[PDB]
Symmetry: D2
Subunit: 74 residues, 4 copies
Amino acid sequence: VAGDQLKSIVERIERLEEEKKTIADDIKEVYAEAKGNGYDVKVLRKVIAIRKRDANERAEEEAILDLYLQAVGE
Amino acid sequence: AGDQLKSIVERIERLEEEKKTIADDIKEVYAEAKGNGYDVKVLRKVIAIRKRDANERAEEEAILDLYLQAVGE
Amino acid sequence: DPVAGDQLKSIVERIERLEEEKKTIADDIKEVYAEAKGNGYDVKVLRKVIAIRKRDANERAEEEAILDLYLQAVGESA
Amino acid sequence: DPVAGDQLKSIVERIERLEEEKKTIADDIKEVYAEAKGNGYDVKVLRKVIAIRKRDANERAEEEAILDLYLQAVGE
């Protein structure tokens, strides 16, 4: 039963991998729609990343960043 | 304008959540395998190998063997 | 095989020599960050400062301008 | 600010100098691979050899033995 069990594990993983790729493709499609509407895809991706984070932490980190940048120059 | 972009953002976020579920499922399968005594590191390697052409895989392995025996440790 | 061994050994050893040197420099960089942290600086922010200084200031200004507008428009996620 | 500001100027200057040094080494490594490739060497295999040599030889032997068994079990 071991041989089959392993084969089923492998097939299970490969299928989830396919599903993950299908979802990645769906995401790419939405970005293509956004680009078509005239949005900046690179910035839009950054928006998504920023929204995952706490607003206050974000605000504080940007405040310190601005402090450092001013000190040494951009 | 604002509503259009918000809808785009919320759709992407929904899809990313679905993708995360799948990624977590994959981690769960590997953990289940480990619990059953399987070698997780090797299992991932098997998956990677099954993606490549058998012949290409075999040639590279043959050259790798050639290189390895020649250089040593 | 004398030839196979000699040819591959030299190329491999040469690369490994360079990789070792690279890691030593990487360790040095880490040491400077450790000093910075000791001085009271935020290492995460400092890394970001380094990355930012690498890119075109004008491109970043424009990208950050568009970013702020997008963020105001869509607000925060639930 | 001599303390808050100028201390940071020195730190950044030092890091950026080291990053340039590291970049030069990275470039030397690329040039080596580019040379080897030009001489008929299989670069992807070379990289794999470098990676392998960083590991315990006995550990790889065991892992490869286990891998062969798994591949057989999955009939692949």
